[PDB]
Amino acid sequence: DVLAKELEDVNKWGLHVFRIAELSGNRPLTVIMHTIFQERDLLKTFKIPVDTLITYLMTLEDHYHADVAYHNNIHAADVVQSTHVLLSTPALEAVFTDLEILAAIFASAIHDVDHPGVSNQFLINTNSELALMYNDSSVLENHHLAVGFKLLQEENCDIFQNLTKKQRQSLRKMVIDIVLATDMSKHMNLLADLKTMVETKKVTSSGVLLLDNYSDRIQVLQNMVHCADLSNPTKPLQLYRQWTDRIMEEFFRQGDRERERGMEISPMCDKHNASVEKSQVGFIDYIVHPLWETWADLVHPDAQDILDTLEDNREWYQSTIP
Amino acid sequence: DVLAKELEDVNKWGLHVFRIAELSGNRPLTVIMHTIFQERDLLKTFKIPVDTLITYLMTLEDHYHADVAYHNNIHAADVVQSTHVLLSTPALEAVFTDLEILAAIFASAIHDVDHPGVSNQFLINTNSELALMYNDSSVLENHHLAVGFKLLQEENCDIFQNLTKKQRQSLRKMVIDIVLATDMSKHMNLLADLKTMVETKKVTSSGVLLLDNYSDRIQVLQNMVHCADLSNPTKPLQLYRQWTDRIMEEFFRQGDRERERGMEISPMCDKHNASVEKSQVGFIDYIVHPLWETWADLVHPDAQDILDTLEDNREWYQSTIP
Numbered sequence: 323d324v325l326a327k328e329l330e331d332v333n334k335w336g337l338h339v340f341r342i343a344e345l346s347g348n349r350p351l352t353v354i355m356h357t358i359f360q361e362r363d364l365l366k367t368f369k370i371p372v373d374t375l376i377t378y379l380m381t382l383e384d385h386y387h388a389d390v391a392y393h394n395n396i397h398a399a400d401v402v403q404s405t406h407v408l409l410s411t412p413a414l415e416a417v418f419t420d421l422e423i424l425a426a427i428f429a430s431a432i433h434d435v436d437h438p439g440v441s442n443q444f445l446i447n448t449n450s451e452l453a454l455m456y457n458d459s460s461v462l463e464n465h466h467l468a469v470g471f472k473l474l475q476e477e478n479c480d481i482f483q484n485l486t487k488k489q490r491q492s493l494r495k496m497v498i499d500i501v502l503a504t505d506m507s508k509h510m511n512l513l514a515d516l517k518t519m520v521e522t523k524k525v526t527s528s529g530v531l532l533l534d535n536y537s538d539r540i541q542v543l544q545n546m547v548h549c550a551d552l553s554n555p556t557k558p559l560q561l562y563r564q565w566t567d568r569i570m571e572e573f574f575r576q577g578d579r580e581r582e583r584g585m586e587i588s589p590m591c592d593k594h595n596a597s598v599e600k601s602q603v604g605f606i607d608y609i610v611h612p613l614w615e616t617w618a619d620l621v622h623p624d625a626q627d628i629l630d631t632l633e634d635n636r637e638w639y640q641s642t643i644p
Numbered sequence: 645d646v647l648a649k650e651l652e653d654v655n656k657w658g659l660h661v662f663r664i665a666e667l668s669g670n671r672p673l674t675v676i677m678h679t680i681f682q683e684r685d686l687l688k689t690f691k692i693p694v695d696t697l698i699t700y701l702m703t704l705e706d707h708y709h710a711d712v713a714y715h716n717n718i719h720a721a722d723v724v725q726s727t728h729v730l731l732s733t734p735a736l737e738a739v740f741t742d743l744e745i746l747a748a749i750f751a752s753a754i755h756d757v758d759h760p761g762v763s764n765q766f767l768i769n770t771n772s773e774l775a776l777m778y779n780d781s782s783v784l785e786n787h788h789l790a791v792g793f794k795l796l797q798e799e800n801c802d803i804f805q806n807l808t809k810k811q812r813q814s815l816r817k818m819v820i821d822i823v824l825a826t827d828m829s830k831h832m833n834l835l836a837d838l839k840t841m842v843e844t845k846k847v848t849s850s851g852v853l854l855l856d857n858y859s860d861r862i863q864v865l866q867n868m869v870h871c872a873d874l875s876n877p878t879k880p881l882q883l884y885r886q887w888t889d890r891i892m893e894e895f896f897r898q899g900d901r902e903r904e905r906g907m908e909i910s911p912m913c914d915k916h917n918a919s920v921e922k923s924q925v926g927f928i929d930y931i932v933h934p935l936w937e938t939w940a941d942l943v944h945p946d947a948q949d950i951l952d953t954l955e956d957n958r959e960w961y962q963s964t965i966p
């Protein structure tokens with residue numbers, strides 16, 4: 323009922339994703355992906371039959387873990403909706419084709435699927451089967467991709483059945499390139515390249531940015547989904563604080579497994595010695611703001627409302643520290 | 645007796661690995677690895693129980709496919725032994741630690757394990773489970789590593805059981821770095837970096853190659869195993885020709901399945917339009933000789949006889965075309 327009203331803000335930074343999760347019966351990924359596919363007219367641009375989209379989105383949502391506090395289907399729905407908005411920055415218009423747009427969105431949707439709630443380093447240090455499979459390199463991100471594509475092969479789940487063979491092949495490559503770039507261990511390289519693109523930036527006199535080679539473009543799409551993955555501190559405070567509660571619950575539960583198994587407690591995962599508010603402001607100062615300020619430069623200045631909220635939320639969290 | 649006589653050649657380029665395969669009851673990898681570990685005193689240095697070593701080597705050898713013409717246990721034994729000889733070159737004396745020596749030989753042993761006899765691109769184009777798992781990136785090479793490390797966990801198979809935690813961490817990363825560098829799609833960049841090193845190379849007062857950081861050391865080990873992997877045309881001709889027979893069988897059988905399935909036949913995989921001799925000449929001219937000429941420069945003059953044989957074999961295959 324009122325699910326319909328909440329969804330009408332699908333194009334706005336600060337969607338009530340947690341409400342939409344409650345109202346949809348814990349299906350925010352499905353309903354937000356559905357809505358967005360209509361808003362951008364993708365069920366026809368790519369001849370996706372509507373029931374095939376739902377069957378896949380439902381199976382995909384099921385492979386996010388409901389007993390994981392942060393890396394679940396609400397985070398996936400939130401990154402989807404956030405990428406959907408960053409794709410409409412005025413300074414990007416005419417930059418991405420429809421296939422590149424479908425790539426960033428599908429990638430956002432699968433980018434954390436089957437997340438166990440622990441870090442790559444935890445999986446490596448524990449000689450997990452995942453790290454054995456993927457040779458310690460972007461272990462989670464490779465797994466997210468493998469599962470996300472694998473589910474397409476379930477019954478009536480191939481939402482790409484009517485893409486041409488080359489379209490499928492191009493989409494698969496772009497999705498892989500995007501999701502692999504969500505690995506935080508690649509944040510610094512990715513930001514350095516985004517800065518280089520800012521210095522050597524080229525633009526119409528009318529604001530809009532000009533990217534010509536695939537290398538530059540996929541680099542923007544990687545940093546874009548990376549943005550949406552690190553967009554919690556840029557949302558309104560009541561949203562951000564719930565995200566902070568959830569990631570800290572996940573960190574603490576990993577630190578508890580590191581304690582029970584008797585290994586070193588990873589940074590910020592020690593519930594007996596954690597400063598949640600000092601961590602958030604350090605997260606902003608060293609990762610989220612350098613990132614979003616570089617991105618705001620790239621799309622100068624359609625990102626101001628977002629860079630503003632980020633600096634507001636950083637001031638508030640700092641004020642919670644005596 | 646006869647086998648022990650042939651294994652006395654284990655320090656010599658052009659060891660008759662096919663004889664040793666026959667004389668060992670199709671166990672060239674087990675007996676050559678065992679001989680080399682004894683030769684380099686590796687069982688004592690790393691407290692490897694001999695029964696654990698034999699058990700792992702036989703399990704590892706089992707997981708090479710006896711029905712694959714080239715990428716079988718004979719190729720693995722050949723690359724192990726060729727790497728063993730390259731490690732002994734005078735320009736590298738006392739350069740590498742026993743752990744790095746262990747990493748390079750171990751990497752050589754597992755570097756093609758469970759190879760199905762088709763290329764990465766074929767596994768990508770046939771939507772294989774392997775390409776699905778590894779997101780189209782170094783599909784085979786990631787799989788070889790996952791299998792080689794996983795078999796260490798079988799009953800009495802952990803040959804690294806008495807290494808320190810730090811030794812095992814360091815070895816695992818070096819082995820991963822080395823095997824991933826055997827992906828031929830990385831050959832151009834790996835050779836470009838090897839050229840740069842030769843142009844700027846440093847030698848010690850003892851005349852030996854100076855490598856004072858991990859990036860330089862792992863790059864030499866990467867190219868060394870890469871050279872051993874592409875060493876068939878540098879071997880005595882009667883060995884080279886049998887390798888060419890085996891790789892062409894594998895190519896033709898892949899091209900058969902490509903034709904059977906409606907796909908374009910990969911280059912050199914079409915038996916009805918193959919040019920074996922011209923392909924070997926182009927293989928040497930564009931891949932093998934540029935690589936080995938650069939390696940010979942790096943270790944000059946230690947590799948002059950190997951380079952001479954390569955140029956003789958090139959001339960011979962060339963002379964069979966008119």
Ligand SMILES: O=C1Nc2cc(O)ccc2/C1=C/c1ccc(OC(F)F)c(OC2CCCC2)c1
Pocket residue numbers: 504505506507551552554555562564565566567569570590601602605
């Ligand atoms: O901690 C994280 N590790 C990650 C690794 C990845 O490959 C991708 C994202 C994150 C991530 C995200 C994250 C998302 C939200 C956070 O806080 C808040 F915005 F919800 C947050 O805070 C942690 C970092 C310092 C304090 C706890 C971290």
Ligand SMILES: O=C1Nc2cc(O)ccc2/C1=C/c1ccc(OC(F)F)c(OC2CCCC2)c1
Pocket residue numbers: 826827828829873874876877884886887888889891892895912923924927
């Ligand atoms: O063809 C190949 N593709 C590869 C991909 C890899 O990641 C690693 C090795 C090879 C390889 C090796 C190879 C090894 C020996 C050959 O011939 C001979 F030396 F045995 C040979 O010839 C083929 C390439 C040109 C003609 C056939 C190819």
Ligand SMILES: [Mg+2]
Pocket residue numbers: 433434462504505
């Ligand atoms: Mg992730």
Ligand SMILES: [Mg+2]
Pocket residue numbers: 755756784826827
């Ligand atoms: Mg190989």
Ligand SMILES: [Zn+2]
Pocket residue numbers: 397401433434504551
């Ligand atoms: Zn995420």
Ligand SMILES: [Zn+2]
Pocket residue numbers: 719723755756826873
């Ligand atoms: Zn090989």
